[PDB]
Design a protein around this ligand. Structure first.
Ligand SMILES: [Cl-]
Ligand SMILES: [Cl-]
Ligand SMILES: [Cl-]
Ligand SMILES: [Cl-]
Ligand SMILES: [Cl-]
Ligand SMILES: [Cl-]
Ligand SMILES: [Cl-]
Ligand SMILES: [Cl-]
Ligand code: NA
Lengths: 259, 259
C-alpha cells in the first residue's frame, strides 16, 4: 500500500493581523513591521492589492508546514507527488512541507485549480492568483510544465460543481500515479481533507457505504496544517505517520509601556 | 552608545499542554506525542519530575526566540554578553536567540540566578535547575567558567529581596562590560524587562526618586519573547532595533473525525 495525504494550509497573515497591507507598504515598498510577517513579498501582477485578496502565510504558518514535513521524514515516509490549491497560502504550505521533508528539489509543487476552495455566490471574494512563473520567482518550487486537471474561471459555482472539481482532480491524481506508486499529498484548504476521503472512497466498486459530500458537515475548520491520511488500495482512513500539533497565541508587545 | 536588551522566554510546554509528562513518558522514556513538543529531552538529574518543575520551550518557543535573534542580525546589531535566568525555558530562549543571531560560538550563555523570577511564599513551586554541565550536554552553548553574581537558594523571599537580587546582577553585568563596551542581553521572565529599566535608571545620577519597584505594575504579562531596549550611557528606554511579534493559536487535530 501507499499513502495519500491531505494538509490544510498554515497560519494566514490576513487572519492574524488587521489592515496589514496598507500598514506595511510605503508606496510600493513593503516594510516588515512584525517578526511574524514575511521578510519580503514577491512581485505579482495584482500588486499589493493581490496580497489583500490572496494572503501569504505568516512565519509561523511556514514553520507549522515544516514541522509536518519533518514529521514525515522522521517517520521514514517519502513524497513524490505534490498538488496544491492555487491560493498562495497553499503553495507556500507545500513549500514549507517540502523544506521540512528535505524532499529532492526535483519534487515540484503542481498547482491544481481543482483543489481551490468553494466559490460560493454568497461569499463573492476577489480571486487573484500568482502565476507559476511569479511563484517560482518568489522562490517556490512550482512545476512550470504541469497541465492541470481542472480549468477554473473566476465565477461562482454550485456546491455540486465544487465537489465535482475536487473529485476529478483528486481521483485523476491518484489514478495517474498508480503505476509509479509514489506517495501523494494534496495541500489545500480545511475542506480538502474531507474531499480526499470522499474521492478515494468513491474509487471502490460498492457505493452503499459512501456519504454525500457536505459543506458544513462539521462546525469548525480543522486546525492549520491539519493532516489527514489514507492508505491503499483499497483506500482506508488511517492514523497519519506523524503526530498532530498545537500552539498557543502570543500578542504584540508595545515597548512604550516601559515608559 | 551601547545596547542593553531584556527578553522574556518563548512559549512554554507546561502552559501550552495539560499533563504532558505522564502523557509522553512511557516506562521512563519520553515519546514525542505532538509536533510542537521537543524532539527529545536531554538527561537531567531530576528526570521527568525535573521537567514537571522546570518546563522546556515548545518548538514554537524556540522559533520565537530565533525570530528575535534573526531580527537583531538583520538590523546589524551584535551581542557579546548574554545572561539567562537558570530556568530551562530561559536558557533555551538564549540558545534560540543566539541561533537566529548566528552569533560566534565564543558567545556563551551565562546562567545567572540573579535573574530568576520572584520566589513568592503564596506560590510555592518545585525548584529544579539543570546544571551548566547538563545544559552543555543538551547542546546549549552555556559558559562553563561563568561565576554568577548571585548565589540563590530554594527558599521563598520577600519582594524587596527579589528586586535586590535582580538589580545586583543586572548592574554588575552592565558595570563589568563597560570597558569592553559590547552589547548585553538579559533573557528571563516577564518581570525582567521592568527589572532592567529599573536597574539601569538607578545607574544614572540625573534622576533620583524614580519609581519604586512593583510586582503588579501592569495587569498582564508582556508577551512571549517580548523585547525591551535601553541605550546609553546615559541609559534611555528606546525602541528596539527589530519589530515586535504576534501569532495566533492553533488547536490539535483528531484524524478520527474523518471516519
Ligand atoms: Cl489588508
Ligand atoms: Cl512609487
Ligand atoms: Cl522525500
Ligand atoms: Cl470548511
Ligand atoms: Cl505535567
Ligand atoms: Cl529524563
Ligand atoms: Cl510579572
Ligand atoms: Cl548612566
Ligand atoms: Na521575493
Amino acid at each position: 500500500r501507499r499513502w495519500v495525504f491531505a494538509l490544510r494550509h498554515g497560519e494566514r497573515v490576513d487572519l492574524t493581523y488587521g489592515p496589514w497591507v496598507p500598514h506595511c507598504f510605503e508606496n510600493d515598498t513593503y516594510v516588515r513591521k512584525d517578526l511574524n510577517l514575511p521578510l519580503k513579498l514577491a512581485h505579482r501582477a495584482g500588486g499589493k492589492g493581490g496580497y489583500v485578496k490572496d494572503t501569504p502565510l505568516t512565519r509561523l504558518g511556514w514553520f507549522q508546514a515544516q514541522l509536518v514535513g519533518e514529521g514525515m521524514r522522521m517517520a521514514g515516509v517519502s513524497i513524490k507527488h505534490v498538488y496544491a490549491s492555487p491560493a498562495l497560502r497553499c503553495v507556500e504550505t507545500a513549500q514549507g512541507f517540502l523544506d521540512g521533508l528535505r524532499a529532492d528539489p526535483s519534487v515540484k509543487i503542481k498547482v491544481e485549480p481543482g483543489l481551490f476552495e468553494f466559490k460560493n455566490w454568497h461569499m463573492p471574494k476577489g480571486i487573484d492568483f500568482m502565476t507559476p512563473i511569479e511563484l517560482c520567482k518568489a522562490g517556490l518550487n512550482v512545476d512550470m510544465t504541469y497541465k492541470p486537471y481542472v480549468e477554473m474561471d473566476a465565477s461562482a459555482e454550485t456546491m455540486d460543481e465544487f465537489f465535482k472539481r475536487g473529485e476529478v482532480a483528486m481521483q485523476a491524481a491518484v489514478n495517474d500515479t498508480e503505476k509509479d506508486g509514489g506517495n501523494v499529498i494534496f495541500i489545500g484548504h480545511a475542506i480538502t481533507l474531507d474531499q480526499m476521503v470522499g474521492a478515494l472512497h468513491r474509487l471502490r466498486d460498492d457505493m452503499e457505504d459512501v456519504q454525500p459530500y457536505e459543506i458544513g458537515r462539521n462546525l469548525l475548520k480543522v486546525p492549520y496544517c491539519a493532516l489527514g491520511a489514507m492508505r491503499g488500495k483499497p483506500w482506508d482512513v488511517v492514523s497519519p505517520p506523524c503526530p498532530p500539533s498545537i500552539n498557543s497565541s502570543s500578542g504584540r508587545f508595545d515597548w512604550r509601556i516601559l515608559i
